[PDB]
Design a protein around this nucleic acid. Structure first.
Ligand SMILES: [Mg+2]
Length: 755
RNA sequence: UUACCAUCAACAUGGAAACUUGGCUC
RNA sequence: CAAGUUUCCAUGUUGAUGGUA
């Protein structure tokens, strides 16, 4: 790990709000023991309790996470200890053998610095659910929602270039007080004779949380013929009944025994697991609650928190940490002095770039909104459409007359050669004839057109068949519209005119440019759209800049082969992108900037060594063509929050800032660029990690190049979460992997259909 | 599948730490 | 070397409503 200077010079500094820890390193050695509880107890409760029962041998300074104990003082090689169970009087044989001597400056200390913090905030009467800690003392209970929300904290200790830190997100968790058992009782009261089908309809596909070990478990089946009075064989090879299993591990004596059982079947590899309804609770958000205007406006008025409400909750967490003595000793025996106040990050607002139109050229303001700049002038990079087929079934005539009769009105300020659509009716929406109509006609409209498949209600098979026929068998676009979305005239201005230009974008109509000071720049946003829940061939979305001023982009999907992890596609995808580049610009690039998507933090090493070296060795297809490459990894689901520290309060700004110190990764070169256009909530910043940077790019150069790449997507008046090719490839990869399950047609490749 | 933007929920994948089991060779 | 368990984490995707629209 080299000492790399990351801070830039050009920009206006800011102030942020989430570091929360600075510790001094003092302990010369920490001693790790792995403990085998013989016989096996599985719950954390006894594994804490009988370890706390023997502080004469272990000591008061303890850190145990279920199987691993940590000490500051070395014992002998193996210590053997006898314990007796509080319920069945078992012969529990604790064996502690020292396995690791943790150095003060080793990255392996992060697990036990994290479990000591979990043991710290388990003393504040804070519960564990899933991964996080949630507070039951500031809940909101919603009776008509049948719901309860907890304002907990997802807190995690991690190492950073600015030392040790603890990142805490104010994570509100929804918990249903209704279990699966009580909602089974409610459905059985609602339907005494016909409840098994409702249980098999609202139970499979639904996912429960069990709180005896807080595990989240996917329901695959529910069985009524088997009760926990029947026994089974657990991991030690000896038969146990489930009630004695409860009394020996979790200690939670059940209230009834005539309840059914739930079957969970894991993925292929195998151990089928059985869960009681009483100890298992719902996912607490009802979609049957949701279908009204009063759901979020009465629930998430507090859950969609302000930045100041985040800072108040986090300062309340710090206050209850500091004012609790028993939590303070559990930090200060190990010598981990938490900071009693927040620790703040500096900022950097970049010199904001220029958006070049056909004639005008704006300096981008602080608001990033040019919503009604559309319908101004005719665009050069457009094929002027004339005719397109519009279909509607036998229930929604005037509903179609909501849309199209307004749409010719926004041909007013443009004044292009427009004509009314082919109003072709439908006799029956029952699966068939909707396939037959479109490729029965395919007529005068089919030059540059727009397929509008309008379906009453939510039906997956209908739109799947329509999009499969209307994007596989013929060169033709398609667009699914549900009548439930357009069912009211109130949602017309926001549904028909400003948006639903998917079809006008699918024929390739776009222009605006951002200035780039470099020469011969090829930027290429590789994305990987994975669908392993369906367990079939993952999809690569390939998009590259095939020109100089970045106005045109490439598109490619190739299905992978199952049981073959090595990518056979990306060489062909780069071959196609380079062939399109040599067909359009008639030249070869000098630098390549790749924005790879979708890897974990432990996976970049693979991207450092198992894929990008294959990209460098892929260039054998062209003679003496081995130039410099730049690789980046984009990240979305981030837990770091950003607030500007105005001298009165905290407000998350508009996108544009740069955070590059004391939040990054310890090994690679990272930065964070905020991309939420914040109207409410806290703006998560996009995380960009580089892998190979041999083009000698300064940090401000690649940060401003990333924001420039964020500036060039034809879908919005305001900036985007991930830059433009990683949303192009997202849209085309999702479309070509989940809906038609096929490659896009070659005959549409001159358009930018990824919009 | 209509512009992105939160939040909620869910699934799946990957890295590290050791433990246990199994596998041709001492 | 492979598989499983427990800890730490990390990562995308999907579905849903509230907002500028
Ligand atoms: Mg993606």
């Amino acid at each position: 790990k080299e000492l790399l200077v990351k801070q830039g010079s050009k920009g206006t500094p800011q102030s942020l709000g989430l570091n929360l820890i600075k510790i001094q390193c003092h302990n010369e050695a920490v001693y790790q023991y792995h403990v085998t509880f013989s016989p096996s107890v599985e719950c954390k409760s006894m594994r804490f309790g009988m370890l706390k029962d023997h502080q004469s041998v272990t000591g008061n300074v303890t850190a145990f996470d279920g199987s691993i104990l940590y000490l500051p003082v070395k014992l002998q090689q193996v210590v053997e200890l006898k314990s007796q169970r509080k319920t069945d009087d078992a012969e529990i044989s604790i064996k502690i053998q020292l396995t690791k001597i943790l150095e003060p400056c080793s990255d392996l200390c992060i697990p036990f610095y994290n479990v000591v913090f979990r043991r710290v905030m388990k003393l504040l009467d804070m519960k564990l659910v899933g991964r996080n800690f949630y507070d039951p003392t500031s809940a909101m209970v919603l009776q008509q929602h049948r719901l309860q929300i907890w304002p907990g904290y997802a807190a995690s200790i991690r190492r950073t270039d600015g030392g040790l830190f603890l990142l805490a997100d104010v994570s509100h968790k929804v918990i249903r007080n209704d279990s699966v058992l009580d909602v089974m009782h409610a459905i059985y009261q609602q339907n005494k004779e016909h409840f098994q089908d409702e249980c098999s309809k609202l139970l499979v596909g639904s996912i429960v949380i069990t709180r005896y070990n807080n595990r989240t478990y996917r329901i695959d089946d529910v069985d009524w013929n088997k009760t926990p009075k029947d026994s089974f064989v657990m991991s030690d090879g000896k038969e146990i009944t489930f009630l004695e299993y409860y009394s020996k591990n979790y200690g939670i004596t059940v209230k009834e025994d005539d309840q059914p059982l739930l079957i969970h079947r894991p993925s292929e590899r195998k151990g089928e697991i059985l869960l009681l309804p009483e100890l298992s609770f719902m996912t607490g958000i009802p979609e049957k609650m949701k279908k009204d205007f009063r759901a979020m406006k009465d629930l998430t008025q507090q859950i969609n928190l302000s930045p100041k409400q985040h800072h108040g909750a986090l300062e309340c967490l710090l206050q209850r940490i500091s004012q609790n003595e028993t939590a303070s000793n559990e930090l200060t025996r190990w010598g981990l002095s938490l900071h009693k106040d927040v620790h703040k990050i500096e900022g950097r607002l970049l010199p904001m770039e220029r958006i070049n139109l056909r004639n005008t050229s704006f300096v981008t303001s602080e608001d990033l909104n040019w919503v009604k700049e559309v319908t101004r002038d005719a665009s050069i990079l457009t094929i002027p459409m004339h005719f397109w087929a519009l279909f509607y079934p036998k229930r929604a005539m005037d509903q179609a007359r909501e849309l199209v009769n307004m749409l010719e009105k926004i041909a007013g300020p443009i004044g292009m050669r427009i004509s009314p659509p082919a109003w072709v009716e439908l006799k029956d929406d029952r699966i068939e004839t909707y396939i037959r109509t479109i490729q029965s006609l395919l007529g005068v409209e089919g030059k540059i057109q727009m397929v509008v498949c309008i379906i009453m209600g939510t039906r997956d098979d209908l739109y799947g068949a329509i999009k499969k026929l209307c994007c596989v068998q013929s060169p033709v676009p398609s667009q699914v519209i549900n009548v439930r979305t357009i069912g009211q005239p109130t949602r017309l201005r926001s549904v028909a005119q400003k948006i639903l230009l998917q079809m006008n974008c699918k024929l390739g109509g776009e222009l605006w440019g951002v200035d780039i000071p470099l020469k011969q720049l090829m930027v290429i946003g590789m994305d990987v759209y994975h669908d392993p829940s369906r367990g079939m061939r993952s999809v690569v979305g390939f998009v590259a800049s095939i020109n100089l001023t970045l106005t045109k982009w490439y598109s490619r999907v190739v299905f992978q082969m199952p049981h073959q992890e090595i990518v056979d596609s990306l060489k062909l995808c780069l071959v196609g992108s380079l062939k399109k580049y040599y067909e359009v610009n008639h030249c070869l690039p000098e630098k390549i900037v790749v924005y790879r998507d979708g890897v974990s933090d432990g996976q970049l090493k693979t991207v450092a060594n198992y894929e990008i070296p294959q990209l460098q060795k892929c260039f054998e297809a062209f003679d003496n063509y081995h130039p410099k490459m730049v690789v980046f990894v984009v990240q979305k689901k981030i837990s770091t929050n950003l607030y500007l520290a105005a001298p009165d309060h905290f407000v998350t700004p508009s996108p544009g800032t740069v955070v590059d110190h004391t939040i990054t990764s310890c090994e690679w070169v990272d930065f964070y660029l905020l991309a939420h256009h914040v109207r409410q909530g806290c703006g998560i910043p996009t995380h960009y990690i580089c892998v190979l940077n041999t083009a000698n790019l300064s940090p401000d150069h690649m940060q401003r190049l990333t924001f420039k790449l964020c500036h060039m997507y034809w879908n919005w008046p305001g900036t985007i979460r991930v830059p433009a090719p990683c949303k192009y490839a997202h849209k085309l990869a999702f479309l070509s992997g989940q809906i038609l399950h096929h490659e896009p047609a070659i005959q549409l490749c001159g358009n930018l259909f990824f919009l």
